């Protein structure tokens, strides 16, 4: 039922590594402060995404057993999860409670950032689906670790080694779901199901960025490695 001492240790360790990311308030304060042009917002996105990948690699390296995996499998897991982790972190930030009217202005500002309408609808639909789960910071952190340690990624040579690292995180998350929402026994399955919806952002991420309403789509060398661009 309850978390074991080893599970508690693992949870706080994951939380500590997860909290090293750029603060949600920092991000929403900039978007809410003033409106930017589609060109300015595109540059804000590439800098945000570059910093996100850098911190994501540091978070990934701290996941227990990650460093014992095959080097080519390590690359495949990072490359296979970076885009999903960015959208999951964006969903977390979007769902943080703000003063009255602020989330509406934040949504409207993102909606007019330069991204095409056809990508707007699936994006905000995912954010609001995530918002309905009323996830805790611990649930976001564990779900991010579970996304990264997905044994089903393309080019993974040793799936069983990845499974062994993901399974204890799924067990911890399942216990947290039973504790945070005892009235909702579907909560864990819901959380896992939203991970399937998360995977849809991979197929169209390159088009989402290339169709941004700007004349030049400049990306950093690191983003070029992780995103299918340039």
């Amino acid at each position: 039922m309850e978390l074991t001492p080893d599970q508690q240790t693992l949870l706080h360790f994951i939380m500590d590594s997860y909290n090293k990311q750029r603060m949600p308030q920092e991000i929403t304060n900039k978007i809410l402060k003033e409106a930017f042009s589609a060109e300015e917002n595109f540059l804000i996105l590439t800098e945000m995404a570059t910093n996100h990948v850098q911190v994501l690699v540091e978070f990934t390296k701290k996941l227990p057993g990650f460093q014992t995996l095959d080097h080519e499998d390590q690359i495949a897991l990072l490359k296979g999860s970076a885009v999903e982790a960015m959208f999951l972190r964006s969903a977390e930030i979007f769902n943080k409670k703000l003063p009255s009217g602020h989330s509406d202005l934040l949504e409207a500002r993102i909606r007019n950032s330069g991204i095409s309408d056809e990508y707007i609808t699936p994006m905000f639909s995912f954010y609001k689906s995530i918002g309905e789960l009323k996830m805790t910071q611990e649930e976001y952190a564990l779900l991010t670790a579970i996304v990264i340690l997905s044994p089903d990624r393309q080019y993974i040579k040793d799936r069983e080694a990845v499974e062994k690292l993901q399974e204890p995180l799924l067990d911890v998350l399942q216990k947290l779901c039973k504790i945070h929402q005892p009235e909702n026994p579907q909560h864990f399955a819901c959380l896992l199901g939203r991970l399937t919806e998360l995977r849809t952002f991979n197929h169209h991420h390159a088009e989402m960025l290339m169709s941004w309403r700007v004349n030049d789509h400049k990306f950093t060398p690191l983003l070029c490695e992780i995103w299918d661009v340039q």
Binding site: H71, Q74, I75, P221, E225
Partner: peptide, 13 residues
């Protein structure tokens, strides 16, 4: 090489 910067960030420290 493919994913040269990622391989670097993974193998450093």
């Amino acid at each position: 090489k493919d994913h040269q910067l990622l391989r670097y960030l993974l193998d450093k420290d």
